[PDB]
Amino acid sequence: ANVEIYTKETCPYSHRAKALLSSKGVSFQELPIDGNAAKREEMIKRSGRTTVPQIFIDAQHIGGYDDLYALDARGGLDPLLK
Ligand SMILES: *SC[C@H](NC(=O)CC[C@H](N)C(=O)O)C(=O)NCC(=O)O
């Protein structure tokens, strides 16, 4: 398992996902693209999407935060933690 999540300090949609991921006790690896544009633009190569947040789990992309919420609550996120 390798949960990654792109975040930005000045981005509340980013921090939204952290209330979820903390509620679910998830072992994410947070990528602040506030003080960074390198790994930011590495994200843009990972998925083609420019915006944050974006979650990746074992190099498979999710989508946005609402996408993750549904992907969690449906049980797509949860069993990949194993
Ligand atoms: S909170 C920072 C910005 N987020 C969004 O705009 C999210 C948009 C959704 N993906 C959508 O539904 O379209 C952000 O990431 N801006 C990037 C930028 O171009 O500055």
From Swiss-Prot:
One of its GO terms (molecular function) is glutathione binding. GO terms for cellular component: cytoplasm; cytosol. Signal peptide: none annotated. Keywords: Deoxyribonucleotide synthesis, Disulfide bond, Electron transport, Redox-active center, Transport. The disulfide bond functions as an electron carrier in the glutathione-dependent synthesis of deoxyribonucleotides by the enzyme ribonucleotide reductase. In addition, it is also involved in reducing some disulfide bonds in a coupled system with glutathione reductase. Monomer. This is Glutaredoxin 3. It comes from Escherichia coli (strain K12). The gene is grxC.
